[PDB]
């Protein structure tokens, strides 16, 4: 029933959106960022995942990250080689998995990263002095996407559908495209240009566009207003997403576990209500407990609160963040377990839930 903003989306992209719309009522796809690239204790293997090492299954949704692509780098900001990334995207898609991509775009004014708050949005949008830079940046994604294509025996080009999730957490003040660093109207112009450029100028037909405010900067007494800060319009969004690490044990959150569980449910309930009103699909696009220090995190802090409310449960997927390689990154950062990690058995239970789908459990999503 929901319809994509790309009325000419490829058959596979249209099928994915339709099938997510159908599956969301009774199921939840599990996602993991950089899942094939490395794990906490390994890197190099061309077909491995911490998630699979624990459960025997790959995640249903594979998240990837393009930061650095726009600068012509051979690897992204976390040293994930782009050629390998293309291989991994194609591999996951070939197995029936779902692909989603975020983009921690470097600051074009300073050359710094996304956390360099030097103002840039006003300069990047149409009419701005650096508008040529925005086009060049987006062109690098167009080229990357070409490296995902195959051509069949009839000479037709095929691509993996991608849930493209740009300019995220824009209601936060930590990225240069965030509140305090860009006007609301300029953010909207940036978003709208991104869609026009990719969908209309460059005629990419394999994208589904995901919008993703951060829950930690939404007033729960006025959720809809907070959620819709910088909202670019229904003609520019397919997935009503949300990044919520807050209600799942963020170190800075003084709320009790019980209040956090209630807030998680409430945030997702309202997210789904917004999606329903707009004829879209909702998803928890980022979440997790860093270093998985919470007993029975998966069943008690994630699945439980989602399943407690039939509205909240209507999210289509939930993705947790990356399992940073320790030997490389110098600190422990991870959101899925690895073998021997304390929450591994509870993660197996999460996998075993009839509601939660990993790659091995997916129906054919692409028709």
Rule CB under 6 A: which residues touch ligand BMA?
A: 65, 77-78, 104, 321-322, 324, 333
Stretch of 197-205, 242-250, 328-336, 357-365 lying at the interface with Na ion (CB under 5 A): 357-365
Smaller CB separation from ligand BMA, 140 or 333: 333
State the burial class of residue 311 (Cβ atoms within 10 Å of its Cβ: 0-12, 13-18, 19+): middle
77: partner contacted, choices ligand BMA, Na ion, none (Cβ within 5-8 A by kind): ligand BMA
350: partner contacted, choices Na ion, ligand BMA, none (Cβ within 5-8 A by kind): none
The DSSP secondary-structure symbol of 230 reads T
321: partner contacted, choices ligand BMA, Na ion, none (Cβ within 5-8 A by kind): ligand BMA
The contacts of residue 62 (CB under 8 Å, 6+ apart) are: 31, 32, 35, 36, 88, 89, 92, 97, 98, 99, 100
The two three-digit tokens of residue 315, written as one number:
């999210």
322: partner contacted, choices Na ion, ligand BMA, none (Cβ within 5-8 A by kind): ligand BMA
Smaller CB separation from Na ion, 121 or 356: 356
**Shortest Å distance, C-beta 40 to ligand BMA:** 12
User: Rounded CA gap, 216 and 156, in Å?
Assistant: 45
**Shortest Å distance, C-beta 50 to ligand BMA:** 14
Catalytic residue among 65, 169, 314, 359: 169
- The count of C-alpha atoms lying within 13 angstroms of the C-alpha of 131, restricted to the half-sphere facing its C-beta, is 10
Smaller CB separation from Na ion, 27 or 199: 27
Residue in 36, 188, 356, 365 binding Na ion, rule: CB under 5 A:
356
Smaller CB separation from ligand BMA, 34 or 314: 34
CA 38, 44, 49, 54 torsion: positive or negative?
Answer: negative
The residue number with the shortest CB distance to Na ion is 356
356: partner contacted, choices Na ion, ligand BMA, none (Cβ within 5-8 A by kind): Na ion
Note whether 208 and 163 are within 8 A (CB). Answer: yes
Q: Which of 264, 363, 13, 328 is nearest to 3 (CA)?
A: 13
Q: What are phi and psi of 290, to 5 degrees?
A: -60, 125
Q: Which of 181, 186, 190 is nearest to 135 (CA)?
A: 190
User: Rounded CA gap, 40 and 205, in Å?
Assistant: 35
Q: Is 169 a catalytic residue?
A: yes
Smaller CB separation from ligand BMA, 17 or 38: 38
Q: Does residue 89 touch Na ion according to CB under 5 A?
A: no
User: Rounded CA gap, 132 and 136, in Å?
Assistant: 6
Q: Is 70 a catalytic residue?
A: no
Note whether 236 and 209 are within 8 A (CB). Answer: yes
**Shortest Å distance, C-beta 356 to Na ion:** 5
**Shortest Å distance, C-beta 6 to ligand BMA:** 27
**Shortest Å distance, C-beta 67 to Na ion:** 32
73: partner contacted, choices Na ion, ligand BMA, none (Cβ within 5-8 A by kind): none
Smaller CB separation from Na ion, 263 or 365: 365
Q: What are phi and psi of 165, to 5 degrees?
A: -125, 75
Residue 165 to residues 88, 109, 171, Cα–Cα distance (Å): 18, 22, 15
Catalytic residue among 286, 300, 354, 359: 286
Residues catalogued as catalytic: 169, 286
> Which residues contribute to the site for Na ion (CB under 5 A)?
356, 361
């Amino acid at each position: 029933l929901p319809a994509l903003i790309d009325t000419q989306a490829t058959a596979e992209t249209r099928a994915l959106y339709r099938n997510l719309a159908k599956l969301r009522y009774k199921h939840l796809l599990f996602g993991h960022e950089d899942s094939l690239a490395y794990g906490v204790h390994w890197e190099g293997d061309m077909d491995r995942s911490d998630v699979r090492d624990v459960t025997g299954a790959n995640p249903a949704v594979y998240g990837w990250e393009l930061g650095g692509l726009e600068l012509g780098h051979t690897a992204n900001l976390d040293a994930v080689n782009f050629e390998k990334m293309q291989h991994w995207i194609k591999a996951g898609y070939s197995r029936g998995g779902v692909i989603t991509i975020s983009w921690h775009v470097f600051n074009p004014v300073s050359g710094g990263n996304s956390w360099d708050k030097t103002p840039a949005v006003h300069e990047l949008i149409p009419g701005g002095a650096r508008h040529a830079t925005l086009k060049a940046y987006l062109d690098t994604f167009v080229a990357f996407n070409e490296g995902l294509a195959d051509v069949d025996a009839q000479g037709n080009k095929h691509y993996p559908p991608i849930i493209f999730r740009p300019w995220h957490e824009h209601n936060g003040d930590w990225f240069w495209w965030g509140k305090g660093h860009a006007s609301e109207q300029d953010y909207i112009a940036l978003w709208r240009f991104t869609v026009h450029y990719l969908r209309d100028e460059k005629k990419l037909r394999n994208l589904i566009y995901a919008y993703s405010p951060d829950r930690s900067r939404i007033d729960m007494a006025n959720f809809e207003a907070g959620y819709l800060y910088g909202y670019p319009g229904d003609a520019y969004v397919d997935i009503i997403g949300l990044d919520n690490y807050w209600d799942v044990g963020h170190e800075a959150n003084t709320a009790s576990a019980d209040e956090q569980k209630a807030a998680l449910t409430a945030s997702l309930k309202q997210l789904v209500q917004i999606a329903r009103s707009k004829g879209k699909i909702a998803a928890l696009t980022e979440t997790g407990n860093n270093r998985l220090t919470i007993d029975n995190f998966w069943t008690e802090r994630l699945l439980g609160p989602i399943s407690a409310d039939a509205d909240a449960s209507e999210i289509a997927y939930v993705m947790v963040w990356r399992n940073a390689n320790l030997a490389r990154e110098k600190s422990e950062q991870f959101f899925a377990p690895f073998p021997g990690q304390a929450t591994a058995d509870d993660f197996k239970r999460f996998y075993q839930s009839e509601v939660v789908l990993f790659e091995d459990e997916l129906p054919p999503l692409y028709r």
